């Protein structure tokens with residue numbers, strides 16, 4: 095009855111203008127994930143450089159002269175691929191490419207002392223038996239605060255951080271592909287695992303059994319999975335190529351809504367476009383779910399599933415020609431296609447305005463809200479930019 | 483009849499033992515492939531970045 | 533066992549695994565246990581059977597779309613297990629006690645259940 | 655005034671219950687999917703087929719839940735009856751035990767179901783005339799003693815089955 | 831505000847070019863620029879990650 | 892017989908997948924070296940400007 099998808103929904107009519115607020119280039123390698131704290135006071139980013147950095151979201155509002163990572167954890171070793179905040183902002187989970195998963199506590203020490211991060215619990219996965227963590231999410235069943243993470247050997251294990259025991263254990267069929275991402279239902283009844291072979295496998299968490307396995311017609315890799323904010327049985331999976339973000343109803347397996355932002359013919363299974371969606375954010379808004387997607391095309395696109403005609407590019411290359419979005423039904427899937435409108439001196443104060451967009455693949459997308467709603471995006475070149 | 487049944491059962495058991503061994507090897511291949519597949523996905527993202 | 537792990541007398545319908553070709557054993561611990569505790573190998577059938585019952589009583593969240601698929605999956609598991617594990621299950625039901633429409637649980641308690649240093653007494 | 659949908663003017667939750675091996679699954683398959691098989695998979699938990707019908711020009715979406723007939727999937731409480739609009743009690747005309755237990759199911763319905771629930775005794779396996787052991791009058795005295803609708807049906811020799819679901823819908827509509 | 835912004839911009843540039851933090855003064859506008867555009871700045875022109883020193887961040891506050 | 896044919900295809904797939912990773916690793920290293928040169932060129936051109 096109290097279904098909350100987000101602790102802080104975006105302000106009504108929130109349309110990100112793409113104005114760069116803070117340019118953070120502290121990471122030495124590709125940023126793998128972005129997460130926001132439950133209180134929205136902090137957000138964290140992990141990178142291949144082996145460091146996890148926690149940032150004060152309130153400080154990115156421009157009120158502070160210099161915004162740098164509030165805390166730097168580097169004791170995990172290897173390449174830190176993903177991180178997630180745990181309910182109440184008191185715990186931070188991290189994973190490394192060595193197979194080590196450690197939960198570090200971010201102590202909100204009173205000013206002026208800087209918060210200290212210390213490893214509270216540690217788990218070392220056997221590189222031969224479990225492998226490294228591919229994706230990780232945390233959900234609290236009230237009695238047990240369980241961090242669910244997926245390994246290379248197909249083991250999805252939920253470690254209950256309260257009792258240190260495994261709350262539940264699922265074994266994915268590796269024939270369905272390598273686990274690439276997963277989503278857990280807001281109602282905590284079920285979870286869906288996406289794979290590298292394009293298989294979307296549905297798992298019922300109440301019974302802890304795999305119920306159905308479906309494969310994308312193109313077999314393209316699933317990049318990010320999210321539960322649909324409105325449809326209780328729909329999962330939004332961004333697939334490799336054509337910047338396609340498709341929403342599938344797992345009960346029937348039919349693709350209900352699909353975004354086709356590629357130069358290939360819509361729904362084309364042949365020679366896909368090398369742009370792909372990397373980050374997916376779904377907010378119910380207030381009945382018209384909005385999805386912000388950013389990927390290898392270096393563009394952050396806001397697709398409005400209710401009024402596709404109003405979708406627009408938040409941030410991208412300054413010279414990007416104007417694009418229009420049209421709604422069309424193709425092969426039974428409602429597909430909104432991005433059509434590049436063929437663009438057919440003004441005095442410039444100073445040099446040509448520098449491009450504010452990212453210069454490399456945007457690897458992940460997340461949002462945080464302080465006085466205003468902000469979108470934080472990180473790129474594979476190691477630059478994290480916070481946009482309003 | 484018993485001798486023939488025993489012979490057929492022995493052949494079925496031998497063929498089944500090979501099937502279980504192949505199934506375990508196939509599972510191991512999927513594990514190793516998963517490690518190579520993670521690397522392939524990592525390299526494709528790395529290559530595009532470079 | 534007539535008393536549960538928490539001393540509460542068993543209630544409702546309970547399906548007890550019948551060990552073939554052996555008389556019921558009363559020694560403690562029983563050699564022919566009917567309720568395989570969670571400490572031994574978790575029989576996927578036994579765990580799912582407990583879950584199906586927990587669902588029937590309304591102790592599990594009902595998700596209509598998930599139920600049709602999940603229960604269909606349970607049906608496949610139970611059908612597959614019935615073909616390989618030919619074990620029989622005997623159902624026994626214990627009576628329930630009600631007063632003023634409220635159900636009461638019988639808990640094992642002894643009738644008599646309700647100075648280390650002396651100054652003078654050595 | 656209230657929000658309503660054109661896909662169904664009314665939605666009736668039906669519910670099939672009855673001992674194991676009576677025919678609860680085959681009734682559902684024969685009504686919803688015009689399907690039959692001799693291959694028996696013992697229903698566990700719940701199943702939820704759909705058929706949409708028009709009756710008296712009003713549109714009724716039937717939602718026709720199966721239920722477990724094995725005891726080992728059954729419990730003293732049962733939440734499945736909750737919110738049910740109709741209940742269908744089934745017995746196998748070749749299985750006297752499955753017939754006798756009909757009173758036990760009516761004990762279940764009266765304890766848990768909606769207070770006005772339309773019952774309907776359906777004598778499945780009515781194709782088994784070679785083995786019928788509960789006969790029309792034998793059931794009709796009982797059914798008429800409760801005033802529950804009654805029919806005899808076969809999902810094998812389908813035709814009786816159709817009238818069983820039509821009857822349930824009719825008796826529901828009379829309440830709705 | 832304009833001078834503060836300019837000083838912030840100079841400091842930000844100094845950080846981006848890995849200028850020797852011991853030579854940078856948060857209030858010295860042209861002095862920081864002179865070290866930045868100094869021919870002796872070994873890191874001027876690098877393309878890579880950079881960190882903003884907490885002491886320099888705190889000194890601006 | 893079907894399992895053997897699958898096993899043969901898997902052996903081919905393992906060597907094939909190993910080669911694809913090796914090619915990408917060398918190509919990435921090479922593009923990293925060219926990138927290092929590009930950064931040096933940019934640095935020198937910037938320093939001149």
Ligand SMILES: Nc1nc2c(ncn2[C@@H]2O[C@H](COP(=O)(O)OP(=O)(O)OP(=O)(O)O)[C@@H](O)[C@H]2O)c(=O)[nH]1
Nearest residue numbers: 675676677678679680694696697723779808809810
């Ligand atoms: N001859 C005949 N056999 C039937 C008929 N209906 C069902 N059966 C047989 O009985 C079997 C079980 O039907 P079900 O609907 O599953 O009976 P049930 O009460 O649901 O059994 P459970 O699902 O285990 O509860 C079918 O597979 C058929 O073998 C019928 O109308 N005529």
